[PDB]
Amino acid sequence: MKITDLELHAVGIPRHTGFVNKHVIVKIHTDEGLTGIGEMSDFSHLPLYSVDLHDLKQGLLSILLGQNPFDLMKINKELTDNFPETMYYYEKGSFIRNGIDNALHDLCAKYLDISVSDFLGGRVKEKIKVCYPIFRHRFSEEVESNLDVVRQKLEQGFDVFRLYVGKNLDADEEFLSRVKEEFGSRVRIKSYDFSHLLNWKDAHRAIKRLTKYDLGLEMIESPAPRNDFDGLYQLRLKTDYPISEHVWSFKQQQEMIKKDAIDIFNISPVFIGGLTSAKKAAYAAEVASKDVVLGTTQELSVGTAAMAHLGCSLTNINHTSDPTGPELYVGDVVKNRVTYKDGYLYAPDRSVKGLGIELDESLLAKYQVPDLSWD
Amino acid sequence: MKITDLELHAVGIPRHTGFVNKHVIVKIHTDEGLTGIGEMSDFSHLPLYSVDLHDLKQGLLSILLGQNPFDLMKINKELTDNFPETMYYYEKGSFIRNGIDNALHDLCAKYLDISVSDFLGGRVKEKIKVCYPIFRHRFSEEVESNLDVVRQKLEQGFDVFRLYVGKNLDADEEFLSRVKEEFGSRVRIKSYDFSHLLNWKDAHRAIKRLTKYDLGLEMIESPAPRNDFDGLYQLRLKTDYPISEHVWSFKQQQEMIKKDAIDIFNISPVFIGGLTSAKKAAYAAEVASKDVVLGTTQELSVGTAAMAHLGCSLTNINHTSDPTGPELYVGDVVKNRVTYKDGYLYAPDRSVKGLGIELDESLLAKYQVPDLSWD
Ligand SMILES: [Mg+2]
Ligand SMILES: [Mg+2]
Ligand SMILES: [Mg+2]
Ligand SMILES: [Mg+2]
C-alpha cells in the first residue's frame, strides 16, 4: 500500500453574505487505486500573504511519495518537521497538515472498508450538539438583522448559537436583551466569544455586564489576548462560567494545562494540524481531566465530516460544539453535504467506508479558483 | 510626500558552500522621485511553503499606496495588523515587514538628506565587534575542515567566532580543544549556540563540559527549546555565563523580561519586523536594564547595513554581535558591498544620505530568481 500521487484543488465558495473563502481540496492516490480525500479548510485568514500551491504540491509529494498511508505517526512527524507549529492561531501550515492527515484517515478507512469512526476509536454517541454563529456587532443598527438570523436558523432547528462580542458592548447587550425578550428560553447562546480582542481585565468588565443575560450560557471563549496564559488563569478565577480557548499548538496547550488556565479546550483539526494531532490534543485534555469542545474555521462538508467522526468518539465533550460551516456557504463540492437536525451534527452512516462523503467533480470545477490569492 | 509604487525583486545568491538562499529586495517609490530600498532577508527557512510575490505586492501596495513614509508608527501598526506576530522564530511575515520598514527608513533619511544613523538617534560608536560562524559538527571528521576555516578567517581579520553546538558534543569538544591548541588566545569563541536543539537539562550537561574550554566565552545562546521561558530561567540560575536568546515577537520578549529568563537579548530586524520594531525591542531591554547583541539570519549588504546603523546607536550592546552574512555569499546586488575590518562592522558613511548602500541593477538581474519556491 503506497502513495503514488497527490492533487490539490483550490476552490472559492461564497458565503451567503458575499465573502468568498478559499479552501483546498486534497486527493491522495495510491498504487491500488484507492484515493483519500481531505480539506485544507479556510486559507482566508491573516497573515495577508498566500501560499504557492504549485510549489506546495511538490514539497508535499516529496514527503508522501511511496509512503504507507498507515504510517500516520511517521508521516505526521515529517509533516510537522516541514510545517512547524508556531503558537499562532491561523498558521497556514496547520491547515496544510490538516488536509493531508485527514485525507490519510479517509484513505486508510477506505482500504479497510470501515468508517473513519471505527478507525478513530468507534462511537460514544451518534451525534453532537452544535451551534450557529452570530458574528460581532459593530453598530446597534446591526441588531435587527441578527435577530432575523436567529429566528431563521431556529426555524431550521438550530436553537443554540454562539455570539462574538467585545467590539461594541452596548450593541452586544442590546442583541442579548432583544433575544431574551423575543425568544425567551426557545434560544440559547452557549458562548460569548471575545476573539482575543480584549485584555483580561477589560474582558472581566465586559463579562460582568453581558452575563446579566444567561440564556443557557455554557462558556466564555478567548477572553484574553492570544497566548496570555496568566491572564486566562486570573480571569478563570474571577468568572463563574467555564473559560474556553482554542488549541493551536501543543506548546500552547501544554502551558494552559500546566497553569490550569482554562476549563474547556476548544479543539479543531484545522488549527492543530489534522485528526491525528486533534486526537492527541483531546487525549492530553482527557489525561488532565479537562473538558473539550470541537471548534471551527467554517469548513465545508469534507472538513466538517472529519469532526463529526471525531466528535462522536470522544468521552470528554460535555458542552455544545461549533462546527456549522456548511450553513454559511451557498454551496459545496460534494454529492451529499453533512447532516444537521435539531442543532445536532451527525456522524456519517457507520456502514459507509471512509469519511462517508463524496466529491462532486462538476462542483469542484464550478467553484475552482486559480490560486489562493487575496482580494 | 507620498508612496506611489512598490517593487519586489526575488534574488538567489549562492553561499560559498553551494546552498542558494532566496531574498527579496524592496523598492518603495514616491511622488517626489525618491526611492527607499530594503531587504526581506533569507526566506529559506521552514515552514516548507513559499509566498506568492505577485499577490504580496498587491497586498502591500494596498497598505502603502498614498501614505506618508514618515508615518512609521501608523504604517508599522497596519503592517502588524496584516502580518501578525506568531511567536515563531522564522515567521515569514516578520521578514516581509522588515523589508518594508527598513526601506521606509532609507526613504525618510534620503528625503531629509541625512544618514539613517541620524534618523535612529545618532552615533554612540563608529563600529561594533562581530563574529564569524562555525556551524555545528555532526561528525568529528569535520573538525579539520572547520579549523581551516578559523585559520583563513583569522588571517582575514576575524579573531572572534561563535560556535553552533549540540549535535555531537564529542566533535564540539574536539574542535574547541584543537582551536585552543593551535591558536590559543589568538582567537575567541564568544558564544556556544544550541539553536534550541536540547531541552534545558540536556543543555546544562553540554554546557558543563563545553565550558571547560573558555576562549573569551561571552554567552550561551538558545540553550532551551523555543519559547521555553521557564527552562531558560532555571538554566540562567545554574549557569555562570550570560544566557542569550533571540527575540522573535514582543509577546515572547515580554515573557522573557517578566520571568527574568535571560541575560542578553539577541535582536535582529529580520526576526522582529524591521528597524522600527527592533528599536522598540532594544529600548524595552534598556528599560529592563538588560544587555543586547545584534543577531543575524545571514542577510546581504542592504540588510546588514540596517544593523550597522542600529548597532552604532545603541548604548546597551556590551558584547560581540553576529551579523557577518556577506561573508557567506559569493556575491550581492549592491555597488558597495558590506565588508569587515579586524572583526568589526562599521556604520555606513554618515555623510551619505539614506542607508548608504546603492543597488546595482546588473547584479540585481544576474541573481534574479523567478519566485521564492523551494528546491
Ligand atoms: Mg472561538
Ligand atoms: Mg475560518
Ligand atoms: Mg543564535
Ligand atoms: Mg537565515
Curated annotation (Swiss-Prot), chains A, B:
Binds 2 magnesium ions per subunit. Substrate binds at R15, Y89, T296. The record marks R162 as: Increases basicity of active site Tyr. It holds the Pfam family MR_MLE_C. Its EC number is 4.2.1.158. It catalyses: galactarate = (2S,3R)-dihydroxy-5-oxohexanedioate + H2O. One of its GO terms (molecular function) is lyase activity. Keywords: Lyase, Magnesium, Metal-binding. Mg(2+) 2 binds at D193, E221, H246. Its cofactor is Mg(2+). Belongs to the mandelate racemase/muconate lactonizing enzyme family. Catalyzes the regioselective dehydration of galactarate into 2-keto-D-threo-4,5-dihydroxyadipate ((2S,3R)-dihydroxy-5-oxohexanedioate). Is not active on other acid sugars. The enzyme product is the enantiomer of the product obtained in the galactarate dehydratase reaction catalyzed by STM3697; the enzymes thus differ in their regiochemistry of dehydration. This is Galactarate dehydratase (D-threo-forming).
